[PDB]
Ligand binder design. Structure first.
Ligand code: CD
Length: 56
């Protein structure tokens, strides 16, 4: 059950089964294993801007 995260900063949803394609988010990367090193592909901030969509 891949979870998704929405960046409250802009409103971008992340699909654990399809994260970023330019950085290299292979299909199967849970936000848990993605520390702050990863940022938003539309903004460029830390992970604090991303939250869990439903099922929290
Ligand atoms: Cd964002």
């Amino acid at each position: 059950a891949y979870l998704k995260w929405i960046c409250i900063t802009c409103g971008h949803i992340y699909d654990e089964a399809l994260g970023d394609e330019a950085e290299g988010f292979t299909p199967g990367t849970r936000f848990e294993d993605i520390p702050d090193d990863w940022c938003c592909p539309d903004c460029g901030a830390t992970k604090e801007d991303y939250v869990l969509y439903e099922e929290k």
